[PDB]
């Protein structure tokens, strides 16, 4: 069980002004720290945030959070469930900012909601340094779905923060799960007039203005004012990052298919699905630490059965261990694992 701590800095809040927080399980014999970012879509204007507050309120408020959470998958402390990092210090950061972890804006006379995702991460890191993170050797910032995109937006800022605070020896790394999306041609098209018809490029462009969203500085300098939405797409922001980042992405991600307006498959949709797999594989060709199986799924690293899927005979926990060794090619210990077969579930280890 990981135990809830609400932030001591009361100015760093969830959407409705309640304090943000983190769940922690310490491992006093370890200098490894895992900080995991929760996912769960986003909201980008007053009307769709109001709807989210009625039926997805745990993603906008700490008012109803439980005192404890059980660690699962990569957050499990049992080697049977977590062969990779079972002895690490474990941190789960709830997603209560609805901003893909990018926002830096308080609730005020002109803002009904606070969007503070980028500042929540910074304050969690700060308060953990007084609870043992000062003695760390490695801090892995991990996350799933919107939290995986959050890793890409924030990992270099965590590295800069620790350097400026006087801890240049802590090695900061990223693990982005199911947060590597394509701004591709959709299978059917709708102009952006409301929540469900607005493609991610248009929704994120509006969201950044609504959230006062923040992107990594080198990527911001490339795309410049008005074009910061480009940095929410992994294949565009990843080449600007300095920290080591491992990319986990299903080739036929269900959330990608949803935003592509895809749900007996005839030729047009067969060609569309096969081309998506090819394009995703192409964007990962020069990513040296990656795990990309040919399955229709979404998220993996905090699932209890995350040990089951394999690419070319190698599991995800093994690939992460091989990554650790490479950051001290390795015989029998690969770090780049991308399926080549062209249809969902052509890999027999795909989750059922």
**Residues contributing to the site for ligand NAG (CB under 6 A):** 9, 11-12, 119, 123
Q: How far is the CB of 189 from ligand LO5 (least distance, A)?
A: 16
Q: Return the one option of ligand LO5, ligand NAG, none that residue 149 interacts with (CB less than 5 to 8 A, by type).
A: ligand LO5
Residues between 154 and 213 with contacts to ligand LO5, criterion CB under 6 A: 181, 200, 204
Q: Out of 140, 162, 175, 255, name the contact with ligand LO5 by CB under 6 A.
A: 255
Tell me, what DSSP letter sits at residue 33? E
**How many of the other CB atoms lie within 10 Å of CB of 190?**
12
**Is 149 near ligand LO5 (CB under 6 A)?**
yes
Assess whether 253 carries a catalytic annotation.
yes
The nearer residue to ligand LO5, 114 or 162, going by C-beta atoms, is 114
Q: Which residue is nearest to ligand NAG (CB)?
A: 9
The nearer residue to ligand LO5, 112 or 194, going by C-beta atoms, is 112
Closest of 101, 189, 185 to residue 148, by C-alpha:
101
Q: How far is the CB of 237 from ligand NAG (least distance, A)?
A: 23
**How many of the other CB atoms lie within 10 Å of CB of 189?**
10
Size of the residue set binding ligand LO5 (CB under 6 A): 19
Q: How far is the CB of 312 from ligand LO5 (least distance, A)?
A: 28
Distance separating alpha carbons of residues 196 and 31, to the nearest angstrom: 44
Q: How far is the CB of 12 from ligand NAG (least distance, A)?
A: 5
Assess whether 11 carries a catalytic annotation.
no
Q: Return the one option of ligand LO5, ligand NAG, none that residue 200 interacts with (CB less than 5 to 8 A, by type).
A: ligand LO5
Residues between 8 and 27 with contacts to ligand LO5, criterion CB under 6 A: 16-18
* Dihedral pair phi/psi, residue 286, rounded to 5°: -110, 30
- Residue 34 contacts residue 91 (beta carbons within 8 Å): yes
Catalytic choice (99, 156, 177, 253): 253
Assess whether 328 carries a catalytic annotation.
no
**How many of the other CB atoms lie within 10 Å of CB of 171?**
16
Q: How far is the CB of 269 from ligand LO5 (least distance, A)?
A: 19
* HSE (side-chain half, CA atoms, 13 Å) at 261: 14
Q: How far is the CB of 25 from ligand LO5 (least distance, A)?
A: 25
- Residue 56 contacts residue 40 (beta carbons within 8 Å): yes
**Is 115 near ligand LO5 (CB under 6 A)?**
no
Catalytic choice (298, 315, 336, 339): 298
Q: What residues does 21 pair with on adjacent strands?
A: 6
Q: Which two tokens stand for residue 103?
A: 């926002």
Q: Return the one option of ligand LO5, ligand NAG, none that residue 255 interacts with (CB less than 5 to 8 A, by type).
A: ligand LO5
- Residue 181 contacts residue 146 (beta carbons within 8 Å): no
Q: Return the one option of ligand NAG, ligand LO5, none that residue 84 interacts with (CB less than 5 to 8 A, by type).
A: none
Q: Which two tokens stand for residue 237?
A: 């922001």
Residue whose entry in the numeric block shows the structure tokens 């769960």 = 40
Sign of torsion over alpha carbons 283, 257, 140, 212: positive
Q: How does 301-330 read in b/e, with b if 16+ C-beta sit within 10 Å?
A: bbbeebbebbbeebbbbbbbbbbbeeeeee
Residues near ligand LO5 (CB under 6 A) are: 16-18, 41, 61, 63, 100, 112-113, 146, 149, 181, 200, 204, 232-233, 255, 258-259
């Amino acid at each position: 069980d990981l135990r809830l701590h609400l932030l001591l800095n009361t100015s760093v809040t969830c959407n409705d002004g309640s304090p943000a927080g983190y769940y922690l399980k310490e491992s006093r014999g370890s200098r490894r720290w895992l900080l995991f970012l929760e996912g769960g879509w986003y909201c980008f204007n007053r009307e769709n945030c109001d709807s989210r507050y009625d039926t997805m309120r745990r993603l906008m408020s700490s008012r109803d959070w439980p005192r404890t959470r059980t660690g699962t998958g990569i957050l499990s402390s049992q080697p049977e469930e977590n062969p990779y990092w079972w002895n690490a210090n474990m941190v789960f950061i709830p997603y209560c900012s609805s901003d893909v972890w990018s926002g830096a804006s308080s609730k005020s006379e002109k803002n009904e909601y606070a969007f503070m995702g980028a500042l929540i991460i910074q304050e969690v890191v700060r308060e953990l340094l007084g609870r043992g993170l000062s003695g760390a050797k490695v801090l892995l910032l991990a996350g799933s779905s919107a939290g995986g995109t959050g890793v890409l937006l924030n990992v270099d800022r965590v590295a800069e923060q620790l350097e400026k605070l006087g801890y240049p020896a802590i090695q900061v790394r990223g693990l982005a799960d199911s947060g590597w999306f394509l701004d591709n041609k959709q299978y059917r098209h709708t102009d952006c007039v409301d929540t469900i018809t607005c493609a991610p490029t248009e929704a994120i462009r509006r969201g950044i203005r609504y959230w006062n969203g923040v992107v990594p500085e080198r990527c911001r300098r490339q795309f410049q004012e008005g074009e910061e939405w480009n940095c929410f797409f992994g294949y565009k922001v990843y080449p600007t990052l300095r920290s080591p980042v491992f990319v986990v992405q299903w080739l036929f991600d269900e959330a990608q298919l949803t935003v592509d307006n895809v749900h007996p498959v005839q030729e047009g949709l067969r060609l569309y699905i096969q081309n998506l797999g090819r394009e995703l594989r192409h964007t990962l060709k020069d990513v040296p630490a990656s795990f990309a199986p040919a399955c229709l799924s979404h998220e993996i690293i905090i699932r209890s059965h995350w040990t089951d899927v394999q690419v070319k005979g190698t599991s995800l926990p093994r690939a992460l261990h091989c990554w650790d060794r490479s950051l001290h090619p390795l015989k029998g210990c690969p770090v780049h694992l991308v399926d080549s077969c062209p249809w969902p579930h052509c890999n027999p280890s795909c989750p059922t």
